[PDB]
Amino acid sequence: VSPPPPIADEPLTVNTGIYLIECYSLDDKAETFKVNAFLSLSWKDRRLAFDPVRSGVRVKTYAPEAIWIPEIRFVNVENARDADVVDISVSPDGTVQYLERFSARVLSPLDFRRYPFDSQTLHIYLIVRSVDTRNIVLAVDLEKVGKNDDVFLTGWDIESFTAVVKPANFALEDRLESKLDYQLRISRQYFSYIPNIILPMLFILFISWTAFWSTSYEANVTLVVSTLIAHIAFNILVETNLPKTPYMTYTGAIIFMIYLFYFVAVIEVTVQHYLKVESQPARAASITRASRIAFPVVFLLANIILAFLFF
Amino acid sequence: VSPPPPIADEPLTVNTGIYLIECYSLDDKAETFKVNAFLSLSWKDRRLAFDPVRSGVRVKTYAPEAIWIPEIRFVNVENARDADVVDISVSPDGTVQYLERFSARVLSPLDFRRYPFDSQTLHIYLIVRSVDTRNIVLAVDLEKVGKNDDVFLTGWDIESFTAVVKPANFALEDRLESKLDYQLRISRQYFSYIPNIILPMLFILFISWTAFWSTSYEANVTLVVSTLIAHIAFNILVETNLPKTPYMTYTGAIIFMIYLFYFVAVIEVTVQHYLKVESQPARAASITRASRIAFPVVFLLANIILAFLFF
Amino acid sequence: VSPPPPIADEPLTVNTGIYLIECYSLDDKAETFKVNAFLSLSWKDRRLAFDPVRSGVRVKTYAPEAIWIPEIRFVNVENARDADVVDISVSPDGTVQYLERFSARVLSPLDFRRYPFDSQTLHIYLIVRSVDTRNIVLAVDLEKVGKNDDVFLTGWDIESFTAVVKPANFALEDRLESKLDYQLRISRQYFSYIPNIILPMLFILFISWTAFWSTSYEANVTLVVSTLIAHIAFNILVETNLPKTPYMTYTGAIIFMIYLFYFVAVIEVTVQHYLKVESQPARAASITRASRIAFPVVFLLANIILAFLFF
Amino acid sequence: VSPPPPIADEPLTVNTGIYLIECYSLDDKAETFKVNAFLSLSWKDRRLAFDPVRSGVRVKTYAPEAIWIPEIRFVNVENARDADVVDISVSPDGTVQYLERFSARVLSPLDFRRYPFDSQTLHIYLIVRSVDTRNIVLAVDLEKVGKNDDVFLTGWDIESFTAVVKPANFALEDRLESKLDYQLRISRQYFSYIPNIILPMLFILFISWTAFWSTSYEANVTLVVSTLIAHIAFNILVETNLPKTPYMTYTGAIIFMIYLFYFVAVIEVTVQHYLKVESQPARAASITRASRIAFPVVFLLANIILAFLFF
Amino acid sequence: VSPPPPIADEPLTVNTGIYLIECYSLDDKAETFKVNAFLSLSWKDRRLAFDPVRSGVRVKTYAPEAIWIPEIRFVNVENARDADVVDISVSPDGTVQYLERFSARVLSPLDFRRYPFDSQTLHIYLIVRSVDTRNIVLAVDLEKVGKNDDVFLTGWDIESFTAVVKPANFALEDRLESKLDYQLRISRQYFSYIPNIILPMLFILFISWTAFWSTSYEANVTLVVSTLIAHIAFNILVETNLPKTPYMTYTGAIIFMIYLFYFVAVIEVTVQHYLKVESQPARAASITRASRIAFPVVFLLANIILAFLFF
Ligand SMILES: [Cl-]
Ligand SMILES: [Cl-]
Ligand SMILES: [Cl-]
Ligand SMILES: [Cl-]
Ligand SMILES: [Cl-]
Ligand SMILES: [Cl-]
Ligand SMILES: [Cl-]
Ligand code: NA
Ligand code: NA
Ligand code: NA
Ligand code: NA
Ligand code: NA
Ligand code: NA
């Protein structure tokens, strides 16, 4: 089969629409998500036109094999989409109405800078390669772009599913390609991070600061070192749920900065002891008393500065 | 092939039934379960009707290709179901009896609020898209709905497998859709959680409270900090078996609240020592004596309040 | 094609046989195992009978397509078996001899009560659905049931591979189903558990009891708390290799009971210190001296009681 | 199609050859390895004979479907090999030269007794089932057996890839089976084990022995218990990279024996303290002084004995 | 179908080109990466030639089945590539322009010597086996070799994608083979390693050195042993993200060497205590004072030596 012939030299417009059914498995480490939706395509093929009076019927159904169907592919998919044809319907003028149900693992990158208080724009790129007979251009039928109300992405809030109506028309391997951008705007449900990582991490830090109300070196060493290891466990736990970024993430920055607080606490604890042993507990008392105010104040200000830089 | 013709303007009723053979792999993190079942379909096609005297036979068997079969899909499945046709049998009046054995990974969300003392309703949604010739409506043939006696879902108790007999008939992409709700009611086997997580977690908490019968700061610091680290390991272990929820789970709440008890124990231990050093062991004795009653009482009441809010 | 016709009203007997070539991947958590075997089927179809004198051949080979083959399925399989036909041979009387090679992930439940000193009976269920023309019944040709000598299941000892010769006939969706039970009897190789989990776990417990020969509270607290944490690690390591059971496993019971020994050791250590501080070291000495005998004796008797209840 | 006809009662010889391209994914836990190779087959089928003077073409090419091809299977594979036909060349006498390139997950058992200083022989078993027309026997055309130079198996050294030229001809389910043995000899690259597990494990053990130059019970308890916990982590780490064996592995034995050294160190530390408290530091001094020589000497001799038994 | 006939004895040149659409999943442990590209093939088949005047058309499209297509395979792929034909276009002279979109898991080895400051050259090898009619040789059509701007390999910087224009022409199983080398040059984004592994690891080491400003053996033992355990946790975390190499990696060397610093710190701490107890605190003071300079200086020089050997 060959593509439909042009009336004049116009390109063939394939109207598209994606309707999300099931949306799942957003892998932060892999920067992938799995989709399960409807793909609706529509184009005019005059060769398929018929008289509704003479034929009796208002629409004609065809098998994919019977007629010409545009080879529509997804750009950022991992493997080729799994698709199953729901319907192919021709109206008297030759307007073909294709519908298929598909599933694909889509590879759209993520910006972890404000993690876990981040929002993402997932992309689904539809593309079409022009044949030698004629150039094929994509379009968005906005009435055929939507999503189910049940559509739920675990640990995420789905904000919008829209399409950038003007396609990107460009050359690739000496043939004209028409790309379309479907954007799924989502925002992370940060709630669980608070009682599971953030608050536990702050509690262990404040426990390390009880060393500023203790003269026992052996007890302080235990307090600051033990809590530093729990902080190491939280750093490891966090960096497992995330990929290696060439930039600093919000949680990454807080986690990193807290190491400096542990390091300075070890110095204070060491200084206090050296001074006490050197028979200068008065000077050690001044340093310990100051640290009680300095550590919370510097922690609170440093956090104001970080939240400011990141948001 | 085309769909059966209407005697009048009535829609075509496809009677359905799901009989679960094997139910398995309930992933709490993914909110998926795998199923292995029979899917039975029954509809009347007058074109297939025959005389049982003239033809000799009582029923006629057909290959799927020979006749029209309604396109039945599952809504909340992950990928398209794996199905294999068991039988197609036509009765003299034209009543078709389709049977297929399928497997699918079903995506039904879970409510972890009362975890691990939760009960779930897993859903299997059957759907059908109306063709242009005529509208297709689903029905439940209750005699062809069930579960095998052997059906076991590891770590769960299977309560019931029923179907909401009235379909959800609605419009989608300008065509009628008939959705059916098959509900699998299950309840978690919480027993293992008690000797593996709950009791070990309570033992480590009570061990931290032996610091209220000790004047040794060095020993108390070790007792409360060491047991706090074991509590962190239990928090990590628990949050691995579960997905990130935008709400508080029952175990999540208890685990979180227990951090506050560790934090207040560190404060008491610190106050006792400061007072002893400040040569006020009488006042430190009053606080330590009070804590011995306060901590268990507040723990017991806080737990009564939590169990009340959650159940 | 249609099934063979009955000489009288008798059902059609399909003689079966499974011969294991490779047996592997027993997942304790999933209660699955992978199998790679031959499935052999034999039934009489009089329509296929021929005179060996007139025809020239002793046996005739047919492609699956050509003749009627009974639809045999596995009940407890996860997904449909992967099968490849080795041979189809018809003798002069019409006796068909089918052979295929297959692989399947079989879902047979396990009894972890005596873990890791448990024995299991894995099941492979063959089933057949009767058609409208005639009822189909399964049989066991014992000369065609066996296993290769090389057959090895990693971490397990293969005891026997037999079949329950009388099928389990029952009605399902108003049609006769003939089920067959192939049983693979295996027993766990517990050897590794001894130097990796059991002996390390006992060593850490005995180390906690060296606190009964020490008056140093700070040292005892460290001994009992540190070893309790290593016991938590062993509990976590063990519960990862196993699924969540609604019953107590043997290792689960020992692991649980050992927590009580750690809890009572913390109490003794606390009592000894309180008494020493209260200037009653004579009474604390009596308790410590008693504990030295009590703890090993109660541990040894409690273990005799457990081994008795479980074996 | 039928198998080629004989000249006499001679069996049909299918000449074989395996040429490894890619060798990878050696799973120690699963005792599997993945292989991407060429499987070459050759047999004579006089029925395919042609005159090139008349046919124009020295050799004739065919699609697998067009002619009879022996059903050659692998014994020890997990699932059926993924194969793609490269070439089928038929010369005028009727000699078929079959080429395919496949990938398979071969299941060949491993001997971990000398781990990580072990050498393995991985097996790839080719098999063929005789048909009723005539018996089929396998052969090795040594000119078509080899491996690529680039063939690298991560963490292993590939020594040789050879075939046992004489097939194993045996009876199975009353039909001749001709099995061939292809052997891939490999030896583990033990180097990473030395700086990652062996030396770290020895360092922590020697650190525990610094307790023989310390009179501080509190410090000794910390030294021996802390280092014992690091040894538990190394035991856990090692047993994760390995399956549960019914025998003792070399690393398993060293790891196990080291527990006894920790247990005896705890006894010495306890004895020293009891004696010091009992006002017998002279006797405690004798035991501590002896331990300084005993522990390294017994460790060194025990290791000589183990290396001797294992190698 | 047969291959195109030669004008003379020249081989058939198949011009190739790979253009990467998406590049993903670089597994350091497995030494694999997944690719999704275009594969373009061009060769002349005079049998397909046509006059543009007489035929009207400028180019003729064909289905893969209609015409002869060279069997191009990838050497270092894991399983056979997933490919889907985009276009086949024949010019009047008989020049075929084939295009297919494919996905494959490519197995190219990695050099972890400078990890995580390493650069890699990933390879994609295209190969072709000569048929008996004529020899087939590969070529690089540089205008049809490239990558998309969006191409992102998580945690890596993509430097270049080029092809070694001269193929490797060699004999294999008595037929010629034409191999082509496509090289993807990438360099690791080491930035995340600094705040997550390197700086945390240095902080814990410096904390261990605060023992040189403390006379408390009990506190020093805790400082050096606790920080040694956190270093073990970093060694384990690092060796999980990497495969077992027969050479020393840069991070591996630093991690290893740091163990020696912990071991010498334990010795110093032990010597200081022995001397203090032996009533020689003056000599212990000299050693402790020296260690304060020795440890940082030796650490800094040893690191200069390592960076020199590795870079
Ligand atoms: Cl696609
Ligand atoms: Cl479906
Ligand atoms: Cl099956
Ligand atoms: Cl019954
Ligand atoms: Cl029946
Ligand atoms: Cl095979
Ligand atoms: Cl390939
Ligand atoms: Na078409
Ligand atoms: Na149909
Ligand atoms: Na059949
Ligand atoms: Na064939
Ligand atoms: Na072709
Ligand atoms: Na301590």
Residue numbers in the entry:
A (entry chain D), B (entry chain E), C (entry chain A), D (entry chain B), E (entry chain C): 5 to 315
Which statements did the authors publish about this structure?
In the lower part of the ECD, the principal (+) face also carries two acidic residues, E82 and D115. E82Q and D115N display significantly higher proton sensitivity than E82A and D115A, respectively. Assuming that Gln and Asn faithfully mimic protonated side chains of Glu and Asp, this would suggest that residues E82 and D115 are also proton sensors. To investigate this idea, the structures of E82Q and E82A were solved at pH 4. The E82A structure is similar to that of the Wt pH 4 structure, whereas that of E82Q shows a marked local reorganization of the Q82 moiety. Assuming E82 to be in a protonated state at pH 4, Gln is not a good mimic of a protonated Glu residue because Q82 is engaged in a completely different set of interactions with neighboring residues. Therefore, the E82Q mutant phenotype is likely due to local side chain reorganizations of Y28 and F156 rather than being a proton sensor itself. There are no significant differences, measured as 5-fold over Wt, seen in the backbone Cα residues of any of the resolved structures, with the exception of E35A and E82Q. The E82Q side chain takes on a different rotamer, causing a local change in the backbone, as well as a cascading rotamer/conformational change in Y28 and F156, the latter of which flips out towards the aqueous environment. All structures were in the apparently open conformation.
At present, the best structurally characterized pLGIC is the G. violaceus ligand-gated ion channel (GLIC), of prokaryotic origin. Each subunit consists of an extracellular domain (ECD), predominantly in a β-sandwich fold, and a transmembrane domain (TMD) composed of four helices, labeled M1–M4. However, the GLIC is a pH-gated channel, activated by lowering the pH, with a maximal activation at pH 4 and a pH50 around 5. We instead found that proton activation is a complex multiple loci mechanism, with the key contribution stemming from the coupling interface between the extracellular and transmembrane domain, with E35 acting as a key proton-sensing residue.
